Design a protein around this ligand. Structure first.
Ligand SMILES: [Br-]
Ligand SMILES: [K+]
Ligand SMILES: [K+]
Ligand SMILES: [K+]
Ligand SMILES: [K+]
Ligand SMILES: [K+]
Ligand SMILES: [K+]
Length: 194
């Protein structure tokens, strides 16, 4: 149910948030969002927060209840139609450290080269080389097992960084270049220099 608001509340610890950033809609309009990573006692979720008025609810000082969110791309979208509120005195919990650690893992690039087209990728990767073009930036990212291209457009075009900088990627689309994988920026994608 791609476009159906999920009523089933999800009750989560906020593990991390990004700064707010500007993103370009398909029609080239500018909107504001931030990314979040949240966890239950048994799983973690990446969360697109398109309603930046919620930033303080995601400050990670409190367990929160999210309802009327969208579910797709294995992630949660919290938008202007969503509700977020602090969990009650009886609804609080701690997240097992195994989940917190799993949430922050990055796949090796040889694994990404064998991954199916259409998957979503979040991860921290070292920059080998950057080429800025008219509307695209090719960020060549590398680990000890491989190298792959990151195609940045819109808010992901022409981000300042140097060889050896760690790029934190949010919500990239894996696509195939003749059996090699590439990571393609989409409307809600983000690059943070780490
Ligand atoms: Br609240
Ligand atoms: K800022
Ligand atoms: K920005
Ligand atoms: K985050
Ligand atoms: K507990
Ligand atoms: K552990
Ligand atoms: K898109």
């Amino acid at each position: 149910r791609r476009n159906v608001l999920q009523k089933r509340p999800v009750i989560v610890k906020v593990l991390s948030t990004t700064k707010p950033f500007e993103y370009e809609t398909p029609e080239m309009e500018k909107k504001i969002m931030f990314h979040a990573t949240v966890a239950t006692q048994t799983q973690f979720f990446h969360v697109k927060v398109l309603n930046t008025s919620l930033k303080e609810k995601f400050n990670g000082k409190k367990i929160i209840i999210i309802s009327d969110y969208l579910e797709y791309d294995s992630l949660l979208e919290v938008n202007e139609e969503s509700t977020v509120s602090e969990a009650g005195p009886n609804q609080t919990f701690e997240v097992p450290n195994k989940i917190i650690n799993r949430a922050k893992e990055t796949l090796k690039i040889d694994i990404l080269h064998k991954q199916a087209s259409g998957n979503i990728v979040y991860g921290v990767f070292m920059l080998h080389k950057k080429t800025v073009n008219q509307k695209t930036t090719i960020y060549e990212i590398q680990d000890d097992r491989g190298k792959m291209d990151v195609v940045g457009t819109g808010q992901c075009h022409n981000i300042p960084c140097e060889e050896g900088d760690k790029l934190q990627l949010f919500c990239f689309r894996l696509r195939k270049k003749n059996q090699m994988s590439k990571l393609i920026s989409e409307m809600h994608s983000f690059i943070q220099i780490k």
